[PDB]
Amino acid sequence: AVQQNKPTRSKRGMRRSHDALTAVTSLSVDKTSGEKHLRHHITADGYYRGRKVIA
């Protein structure tokens, strides 16, 4: 359960090739306030789909 000899930096980067983060495609623009937010998430301002829900 221990390595027989050390793995190279070559085999390190190949394994970390799948560890890359995926950025969001794009954010949405609300109809009234026009601020950016995630899809299907209420704004930091409390707007969601043209409707203020939370002060």
Partner RNA sequence: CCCGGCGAGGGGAGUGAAAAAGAACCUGAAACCGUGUACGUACAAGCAGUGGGAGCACGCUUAGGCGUGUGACUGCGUACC
Partner RNA sequence: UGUAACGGGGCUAAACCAUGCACCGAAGCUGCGGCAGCGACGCUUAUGCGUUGUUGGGUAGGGGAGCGUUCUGUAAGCCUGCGAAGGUGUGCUGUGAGGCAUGCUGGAGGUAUCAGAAGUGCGAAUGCUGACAUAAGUAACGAUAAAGCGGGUGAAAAGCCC
Site stretch for RNA (CB under 7 A), options 2-10, 23-31, 33-41, 45-53? 2-10
For residues 29 and 44, which CB has a smaller minimum distance to RNA in the complex?
44
Q: What is the DSSP letter of 28?
A: E
Residues 8 to 27 in contact with RNA, rule: CB under 7 A:
9, 11-13, 15-16, 19
For residues 9 and 39, which CB has a smaller minimum distance to RNA in the complex?
9
27 binds another protein (CB under 8 A): yes
Sign, Cα dihedral of 38, 41, 44, 45:
positive
Q: How far is CA 14 from CA 7, 8, 23, 48, 51, in A?
A: 11, 10, 20, 42, 47
